[PDB]
Structure to design on (155 residues):
């Protein structure tokens, strides 16, 4: 069901994460971490202290899809992660959906914080407005392997 998901998304902040390869999103899915460049690190750190939930939505560049989304559980903090690359600290994340979603299913969603361009268009780190980000997350296929009870307890 979607109800606990809606609870987690309530008044959350959303950010578009662009990755240039699948290897890094596979590592993120496996180890519950992410790292980004400092301009985005400072944005995410400010947003983490600001909101009940800060959601990253992942897209690998040239794939035509989003690869899932996750929730910040930490601020960035400085075991070396062997990304396929000046980086910042490491955020710990909790995955809410590890399922893909093709851009063709999100064509009706525009992002007011990026000139109302379709939500798939955006620089790495681009913030997604509340309602667009919420509906984008609800578009993903339900990930039956994930239990949001643990995640709700961290709010």
């Amino acid at each position: 069901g979607t109800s606990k998901l809606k609870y987690v998304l309530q008044d959350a902040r959303f950010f578009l994460i662009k990755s240039n390869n699948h290897e890094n999103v596979s590592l993120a899915k496996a180890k519950g971490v992410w790292s980004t460049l400092p301009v985005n690190e400072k944005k995410l750190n400010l947003a983490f202290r600001s909101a009940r939930s800060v959601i990253l939505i992942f897209s690998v560049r040239e794939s035509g899809k989003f690869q899932g989304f996750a929730r910040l559980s930490s601020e960035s903090h400085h075991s070396p992660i062997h990304w396929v690359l000046m980086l910042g600290g490491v955020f710990k994340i909790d995955w809410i959906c590890r399922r893909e979603l093709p851009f063709t299913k999100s064509a009706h969603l525009t992002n007011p914080w990026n000139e109302h361009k379709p939500v798939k268009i955006g620089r790495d780190g681009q913030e997604i407005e509340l309602e667009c980000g919420t509906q984008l997350c609800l578009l993903f296929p339900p990930d039956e392997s994930i239990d949001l009870y643990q995640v709700i307890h961290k709010m």
In short: The CA atoms of residues 122 and 134 lie 17 Å apart. The two ends are 20 Å apart (CA to CA).
